[PDB]
Design an enzyme around this catalytic site. Structure first.
Site, PDB file in Angstrom:
ATOM      1  N   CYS A   1      -2.545  -3.875  -0.230  1.00  0.00           N
ATOM      2  CA  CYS A   1      -2.108  -2.575  -0.723  1.00  0.00           C
ATOM      3  C   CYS A   1      -2.752  -1.437   0.055  1.00  0.00           C
ATOM      4  CB  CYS A   1      -2.449  -2.484  -2.203  1.00  0.00           C
ATOM      5  SG  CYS A   1      -4.193  -2.737  -2.488  1.00  0.00           S
TER       6      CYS A   1
ATOM      7  N   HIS B   1      -6.002  -1.195  -6.725  1.00  0.00           N
ATOM      8  CA  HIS B   1      -4.706  -1.106  -6.057  1.00  0.00           C
ATOM      9  C   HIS B   1      -4.579   0.243  -5.359  1.00  0.00           C
ATOM     10  CE1 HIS B   1      -0.611  -2.071  -5.115  1.00  0.00           C
ATOM     11  NE2 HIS B   1      -0.102  -1.131  -5.894  1.00  0.00           N
TER      12      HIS B   1
ATOM     13  N   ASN C   1       4.693   3.139  -4.259  1.00  0.00           N
ATOM     14  CA  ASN C   1       4.068   1.824  -4.308  1.00  0.00           C
ATOM     15  C   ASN C   1       4.544   1.015  -3.089  1.00  0.00           C
ATOM     16  OD1 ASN C   1       2.476  -0.300  -5.344  1.00  0.00           O
ATOM     17  ND2 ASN C   1       3.775  -0.653  -7.146  1.00  0.00           N
TER      18      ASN C   1
ATOM     19  N   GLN D   1       4.504  -5.425   0.259  1.00  0.00           N
ATOM     20  CA  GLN D   1       3.338  -6.154   0.745  1.00  0.00           C
ATOM     21  C   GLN D   1       3.416  -7.649   0.461  1.00  0.00           C
ATOM     22  OE1 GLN D   1       0.980  -3.947  -2.420  1.00  0.00           O
ATOM     23  NE2 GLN D   1      -0.321  -5.758  -2.227  1.00  0.00           N
TER      24      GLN D   1
HETATM   25  C1  LIG Z   1      -4.133  -4.337  -3.234  1.00  0.00           C
HETATM   26  O1  LIG Z   1      -3.229  -5.261  -2.635  1.00  0.00           O
HETATM   27  C2  LIG Z   1      -5.546  -4.892  -3.151  1.00  0.00           C
HETATM   28  N1  LIG Z   1      -6.481  -4.015  -3.834  1.00  0.00           N
HETATM   29  C3  LIG Z   1      -7.418  -3.311  -3.226  1.00  0.00           C
HETATM   30  O2  LIG Z   1      -7.754  -3.433  -2.046  1.00  0.00           O
HETATM   31  O3  LIG Z   1      -8.060  -2.332  -4.081  1.00  0.00           O
HETATM   32  C4  LIG Z   1      -8.873  -1.245  -3.644  1.00  0.00           C
HETATM   33  C5  LIG Z   1     -10.119  -1.774  -2.946  1.00  0.00           C
HETATM   34  C6  LIG Z   1      -9.266  -0.547  -4.949  1.00  0.00           C
HETATM   35  C7  LIG Z   1      -8.135  -0.361  -2.652  1.00  0.00           C
END
Ligand SMILES: *[C@@H](O)CNC(=O)OC(C)(C)C
Ligand code: NA
Ligand code: NA
Length: 220
Positions: A25, A163, A187, A19
């Site tokens: 993510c 994440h 991941n 990413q």
């Molecule tokens: C990951 O790049 C960004 N994090 C994210 O969107 O967290 C959640 C809302 C918990 C999915």
């Protein structure tokens, strides 16, 4: 349920992606889950466009490189009637205007299913559906430097996830502490992170890092 499951052996899983420096993510987790369900349907494994979700799924509640939710991404695909392939709509790691083109759509879904917030229910879903989208607390240095083994972080929160990742299976291996069970997690930080881009997350240790708190998959 089975004691070991690995959907990579059955052909449900694309190679590890990266990413970059964008908070997308959630788009990699969603494409991973839909890639599995589309393969389960059609028998074809086709890599799907995260950039498509980053650019276009704001009306469903997503926010590009500033975060989003896999379920919002599954709803977009349903609302939108399609999702373009990774080759046709490549990943740029930055939010831009929506360039979706239905001619290059290679996937669809009819909604999604949210898993009860118990690891036992997640196990049953992984055992029977395929790869599952999940959110975890990855906000600890230990997660950055992970190399191998079963990841366990005592300061990991089960409620505050930051994440999105993808459970492709689960299994076990003997350890010092006899805490031997893990989720096999793909991941989206490239294959140089962790074990070829994968991590073994502690399983059945009190919803460690929140892996069962926001689990879902798309319905195809
Ligand atoms: C990951 O790049 C960004 N994090 C994210 O969107 O967290 C959640 C809302 C918990 C999915
Ligand atoms: Na970063
Ligand atoms: Na909608």
């Amino acid at each position: 349920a089975p004691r070991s499951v690995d959907w990579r052996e059955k052909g449900y899983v694309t190679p590890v992606k990266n990413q970059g420096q964008c908070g997308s993510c959630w788009a990699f987790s969603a494409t991973g889950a839909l890639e599995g369900q589309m393969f389960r349907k059609t028998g074809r494994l086709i890599s799907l466009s995260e950039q498509n979700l980053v650019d276009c799924s704001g009306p469903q509640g997503n926010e590009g490189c500033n975060g989003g939710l896999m379920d919002y991404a599954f709803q977009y695909v349903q609302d939108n009637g399609g999702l373009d392939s990774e080759e046709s709509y490549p990943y740029e790691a930055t939010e831009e205007s929506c360039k979706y083109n239905p001619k290059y759509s290679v996937a669809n879904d009819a909604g999604f299913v949210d898993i009860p917030k118990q690891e036992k229910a997640l196990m049953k879903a992984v055992a029977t559906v395929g790869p599952i989208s999940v959110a975890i607390d990855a906000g600890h240095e230990s997660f950055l430097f992970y190399k191998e083994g079963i990841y366990f972080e005592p300061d990991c929160s089960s409620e505050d996830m930051d994440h999105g990742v993808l459970v492709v299976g689960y299994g076990f291996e003997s350890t010092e502490s006899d805490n031997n069970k893990y989720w096999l997690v793909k991941n989206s930080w490239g294959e140089e992170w962790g074990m070829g881009g994968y991590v073994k997350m502690a399983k059945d240790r009190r919803n460690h890092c929140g892996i069962a708190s926001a689990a879902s998959y798309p319905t195809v």
